[PDB]
Amino acid sequence: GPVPSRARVYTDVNTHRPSEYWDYESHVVEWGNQDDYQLVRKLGRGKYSEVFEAINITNNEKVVVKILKPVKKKKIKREIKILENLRGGPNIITLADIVKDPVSRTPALVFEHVNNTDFKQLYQTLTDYDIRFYMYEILKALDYCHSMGIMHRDVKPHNVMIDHEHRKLRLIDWGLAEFYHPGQEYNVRVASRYFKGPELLVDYQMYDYSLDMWSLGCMLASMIFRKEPFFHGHDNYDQLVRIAKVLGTEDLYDYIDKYNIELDPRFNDILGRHSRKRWERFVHSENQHLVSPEALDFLDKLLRYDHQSRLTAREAMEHPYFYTVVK
Amino acid sequence: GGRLYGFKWHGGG
Ligand SMILES: *Cn1cc(-c2cc(C(=O)O)cc(-c3cn(C*)nn3)c2)nn1
């Protein structure tokens, strides 16, 4: 079978924490009073949730209410435990309350008010400095959650809320997040198609925090090259083909061999054989002002097939691409 | 008698 793998960093964090920390199925939810909150306007609708601008009538504070549909309601304890464990961490969305309809039994998460603007709305208009600045803010959140034994597993522009005027960023939607336990085989049906790192696409289950780093690299590539999404696959199989047309197939087969991954035979007629393309091939007159040797060196060190070979969030924070960021 | 998933609404203003 497949060769085991362990995270290079924060490997045994959860072993050194009590079961109360990571045993979300045993968590006793602290329910607030639903009548403290009133809906103002609908902000959107996820695959398993509904989001609203709302108000806390006990103190007139603006809040965001996320109503969880049955499939998300079933894993609510995991999302709640992760949000409470990470609460107060850098650029982590703050969970303010948890309520439930006494009639329908529908649960809802109440969060700290965040301006209703996602990264995707602006990330295609930013200056070179702003891309570095916001990337660094996302890295602070990822290094924190990874250091706390948690993988986000759904890093993408829509899950990054930015108040551009106040240069403030929050990592949201922890509904797919999980606790990392070394040697654990996880469900590969995580992350959105364009931000799925290769381990998911080849059904390699023993992945870790480095999955979030591949997704972050996909966001960077889209930002610096003005190409949304950067790897534009039509399904999970074609997504791996789009990646192989850039990273090349030689390194893919070396990766599959290293971890003894069984490559689905459907890939036989579609992957083909491709050279590794130089990152400079994506540079053109409309994006050249966002590209630098440091941006390309950094991107090259995130977008690697081998999950252990990718920069960690803290190593990424130390890259020269971020030297101009005011820390 | 006007609730969405049990929440009342706060419009106008
Ligand atoms: C009893 N009840 C109240 C409502 C309801 C529905 C909406 C909606 O947008 O669907 C909005 C509001 C509302 C907005 N404002 C300013 N005041 N009320 C109320 N449906 N059923």
Numbering used by the authors:
A (entry chain A): 3 to 329
B (entry chain C): 2 to 14
What's in the article?
CK2 is a protein kinase overexpressed in cancer cells and a validated oncology target; CX4945, a traditional small molecule ATP-binding site inhibitor of CK2, is currently undergoing clinical studies. Among the strategies designed to target CK2 outside its orthosteric binding site, is the inhibition of the PPI between the α and the β subunits. Disruption of the holoenzyme assembly affects the function of CK2 by preventing phosphorylation of β-dependent substrates, the shuttling of the protein between different intracellular compartments, and by reducing the stability of the catalytic α subunit.30–33 With the exception of the Phe pocket, the CK2α/β interface is a shallow and hydrophobic surface; consequently, peptides are an ideal class of molecule to target this PPI. In order to design stable peptides targeting the CK2α/β interaction, we used a rational-design approach based on the valuable crystal structures of CK2β and the disulfide bridged Pc peptide.
